[PDB]
Amino acid sequence: DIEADHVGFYGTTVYQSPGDIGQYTHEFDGDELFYVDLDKKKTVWRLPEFGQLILFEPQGGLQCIAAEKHNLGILTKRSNFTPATNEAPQATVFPKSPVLLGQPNTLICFVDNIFPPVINITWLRNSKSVTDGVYETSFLVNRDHSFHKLSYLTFIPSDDDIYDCKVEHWGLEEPVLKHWEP
């Protein structure tokens, strides 16, 4: 909607009740700079090189979470306790680079329309859990105030690649098992 050469989110915050779940992140041009590990009080850079000479004081994200906890209490009453609507998330999986037999690659599970921001994304190969080396982003903000998140699974393409991205969310009656079509 607002056009610009660049946009920084220097303050992306979400908090929810009950459950006392939240996150604090910064973004630049739609990519995550860091999140603040609230309980450990520390900045976790999306790529480790980001924080080599630049610091972000984690207290900033703690302040914002504290303010959002307070703000939620007010607005929840003001709304006459209107609850969030659980959305059905949408998953797509695609490779980072062109698939070539034997050549190292990464499967990316892109999960969109996430709301509230609580989800489990996991990977299966040959319908068996694979957790080694899996990485996932923080919740990244959407203009419509839902979220998306990506999970990553390193793999070596093979003859019969059978990979699935499993998404569990309160907005789903059954878990979505999203198959990767090579």
Add this chain to the structure above:
Amino acid sequence: LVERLYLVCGEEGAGGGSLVGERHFVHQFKGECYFTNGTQRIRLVTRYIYNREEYLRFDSDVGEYRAVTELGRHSAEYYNKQYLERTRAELDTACRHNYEETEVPTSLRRLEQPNVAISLSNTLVCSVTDFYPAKIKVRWFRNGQEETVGVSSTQLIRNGDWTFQVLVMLEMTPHQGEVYTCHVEHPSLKSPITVEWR
């Protein structure tokens, strides 16, 4: 170590006290800095959101907090009296500082070269992967002529790891003697990339 700064989350003048305890309730804050032509024009927008409804917003083009929906009517007056002057100042002390002192030495200098490969499946697919930043130009050539009709393209795909990819397709039919090339220009490349397919 220079420092990234943040946009402070303003609190309702509350005091609160109501309790909610399959129902959940969500609040969001978004502090957004828009930059065009360096820092020559900066626009700061802060958003206060209940569930998915933005109800209160500071917009530096507007100059103060305004209720976006009725839910924010009472909020705006309070935020203007408590936080207006320091929110205005954050256009310089947070948006401009972050761009000039932290993005200039990191995000804005980051360069990653696209990998370019051609596959069939007819449709020739030029896979342009793992590049940063987003600015790229990909063109298909069929024996020396830049193609127009018959070309399609994915959206620019954000990998989430500070790289992009785009797949650029050419509808075609193979014939014994023709050459096809995808040409890629990107700020990271010393020279444009050409990959031929026969």
